[PDB]
Amino acid sequence: QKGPVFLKEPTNRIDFSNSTGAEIECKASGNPMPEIIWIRSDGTAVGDVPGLRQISSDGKLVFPPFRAEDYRQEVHAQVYACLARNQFGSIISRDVHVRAVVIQSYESEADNEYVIRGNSVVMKCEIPSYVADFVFVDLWLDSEGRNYYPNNAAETDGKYLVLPSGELHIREVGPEDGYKSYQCRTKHRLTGETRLSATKGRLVITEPVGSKAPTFATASKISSLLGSSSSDIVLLCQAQAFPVPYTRWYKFIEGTTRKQAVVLNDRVKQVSGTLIIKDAVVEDSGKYLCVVNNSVGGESVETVLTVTAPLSAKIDPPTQTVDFGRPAVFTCQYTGNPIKTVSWMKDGKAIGHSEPVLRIESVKKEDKGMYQCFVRNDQESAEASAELKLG
């Protein structure tokens, strides 16, 4: 009757630990019911590797736990896929990127941050490059025993705020905050075990010796950051000075030298120089300018934001019947941000086109089969299925 249609596909990124292991599933339907075949991204089938990779009873790729010594790259750190197939044609899933990571002991360095009294500060949990993806801050803790818990910012009103980007924001530091010391404890999203910071950060408060220029923590006059759609994103202004200055956030109008001021809502909030875009959307993207002036002068810093949305695609029509000699067109409709490549596939084999509209002019008995459009950006991809028929 019909061709294979993908129901449950795995996720673009599958990460796990050598102690846990993983078993991933792929589901397709149609008449006759297709059989699920596991393959690499280049379309080559994968066999067992006893102790590492084994295909189980029903259509399920398994990665049992393993010694750190038994780690094998081509098995664990790999690009995978899922192939559903029957009489009509074949289809491939979105590329499934597996990275299995052995448990590797890590430590968090809470950095002492220099400040002038009256200025607000943000102190950071320094985390190594390699665990940064798998680890984040569970909470903040001081020497006095007060836990500062991380939160979506509904209420930005308070002395202490733990913001979603993982830092601890303190409004207008003073002597009372001077002899307090702070720990950050982090959680591994695979293991789920918590670890306190080894070194404790402390606020070092200088006094308004002079009156000076605004000074950012770095010489960088431009930055960039990325955030998801539903996430609460945090831009930063780390500017420091005396006398304590005021912050103004602006957003650039695209492709021109003309700026515009950021409108604050119960959605968009400001704390010190910290801008909070909480409950974001793609249109929040653009070039931003933080501007801090004081009595002695002023300086400014650019920031490039890009909001990403989940890639999804649907082919119109899911199926169509045509007669020999008549044109048959397929149109791939997509969402998510950003987009780089849209590409077409036939029965598992590629067709060079960058266009969302696939147009065959005169059908052939050759052209009968299954069609797919592949939408992709660096960190993500998606798969929509389609069938062709003849008369």
Ligand X SMILES: *[C@@H]1O[C@H](CO)[C@@H](O[C@@H]2O[C@H](CO)[C@@H](O)[C@H](O)[C@H]2NC(C)=O)[C@H](O)[C@H]1NC(C)=O
Ligand Y SMILES: *[C@@H]1O[C@H](CO)[C@@H](O[C@@H]2O[C@H](CO)[C@@H](O[C@@H]3O[C@H](CO[C@H]4O[C@H](CO)[C@@H](O)[C@H](O)[C@@H]4O)[C@@H](O)[C@H](O)[C@@H]3O)[C@H](O)[C@H]2NC(C)=O)[C@H](O)[C@H]1NC(C)=O
The site for ligand X (CB under 6 A) is made up of 291, 293, 298-300, 378
Q: Which is nearer to its own copies, 46 or 322 (CB)?
A: 46
222 lies in the site for its own copies, by CB under 8 A: yes
**138 contacts: CB under 8 Å, gap ≥ 6:** 150, 185, 186, 187, 194
d(CA 158, CA 165): 18
- Nearest distance, CB of residue 313 and ligand X, angstroms: 18
Site for its own copies in 43-62 (CB under 8 A): none
Q: Which is nearer to ligand Y, 103 or 262 (CB)?
A: 103
Peptide bond into 128 cis (omega under 30): no
- Which residue reads 């996720």 in tokens? 11
Residue 53: name the closest of 77, 26, 82 by CA.
Answer: 77
- Nearest distance, CB of residue 67 and ligand NAG, angstroms: 4
105 lies in the site for ligand Y, by CB under 6 A: yes
Q: Which is nearer to its own copies, 93 or 303 (CB)?
A: 303
Select the residue interacting with ligand Y from 52, 103, 190, 268 (CB under 6 A): 103
Site for its own copies in 164-203 (CB under 8 A): 199
Q: Which is nearer to ligand NAG, 190 or 244 (CB)?
A: 190
- Nearest distance, CB of residue 63 and ligand Y, angstroms: 11
Q: Which is nearer to ligand Y, 102 or 226 (CB)?
A: 102
65 lies in the site for ligand NAG, by CB under 6 A: yes
25 lies in the site for Zn ion, by CB under 5 A: no
Residue 323 token pair:
């007669």
Q: Which amino acid is at 83?
A: L
Binding mask 237-266 for its own copies (x = CB under 8 A): -xxxx-------------------------
d(CA 193, CA 359): 53
d(CA 307, CA 226): 6
233 lies in the site for its own copies, by CB under 8 A: no
> Which among 65-73, 194-202, 256-264, 284-292 is the span making contact with ligand NAG, rule CB under 6 A?
65-73
Select the residue interacting with its own copies from 191, 215, 337, 377 (CB under 8 A): 215
Binding mask 297-336 for its own copies (x = CB under 8 A): --x----x--------------------------------
- Nearest distance, CB of residue 120 and ligand Y, angstroms: 24
Q: Which is nearer to ligand X, 115 or 291 (CB)?
A: 291
d(CA 76, CA 78): 6
Residue 119: name the closest of 263, 2, 235, 292 by CA.
Answer: 292
Q: Which is nearer to its own copies, 279 or 299 (CB)?
A: 299
Select the residue interacting with its own copies from 65, 118, 216, 248 (CB under 8 A): 216
- Binding residues for ligand NAG, per CB under 6 A? 18-19, 65, 67-68, 102-103
- Binding residues for ligand Y, per CB under 6 A? 18-19, 65-68, 102-105, 209
- Binding residues for its own copies, per CB under 8 A? 18, 68, 71, 73, 76-77, 99-107, 109, 111-112, 114, 116, 126, 128-130, 132-133, 199, 204, 206-207, 209-213, 215-226, 238-241, 295-296, 299, 304, 378
